[PDB]
Design a protein around this ligand. Sequence first.
Ligand SMILES: [Mg+2]
Length: 110
Amino acid sequence: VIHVQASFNNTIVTVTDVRGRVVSWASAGTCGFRGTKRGTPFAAQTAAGNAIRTVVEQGMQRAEVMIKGPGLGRDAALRAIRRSGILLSFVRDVTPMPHNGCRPPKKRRV
RNA sequence: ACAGGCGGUGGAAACUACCAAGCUGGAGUACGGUAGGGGCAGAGGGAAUUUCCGGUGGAGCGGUGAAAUGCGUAGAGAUCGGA
Ligand SMILES: [Mg+2]
């Protein structure tokens, strides 16, 4: 399984088995980016490549991607995962869905 | 003098009012149907978030017009499971 978390400030990529035990991970920050460059779609490509490249070597051709949240790199990360030597079954997005649960913050003025 | 005010007196009875009977168009009751987050009170339900418990794993996470404070190898964030 390949959990990916998209956002405007960073994109995280954690790999794990079906049982939920991580084997490796890497984000835009670990790759070398910092600040606003992390949220760019290009950083998601390079961040996804470094995390999955070690996994393709250790067998496990099967994979499932779990997208979580918005961002510019969520679509670019698919090109990184697709541009690889692995198949995949699910392309589902495990996003939260609050039914008017809590109070969000106030709107920004600037 | 007119106009106007007060009081008395004899007449007219539409209108306002009074008195005696009538009607139902306004209003209301009894019925028979009907929609709705009307209100009060008591039970039931799920996600989401937060904290704690552990497992996995190892360096960033998070934030900004840019940055830092801050959280983190005393194991964060992420990822399954549970209260
Ligand atoms: Mg008369």
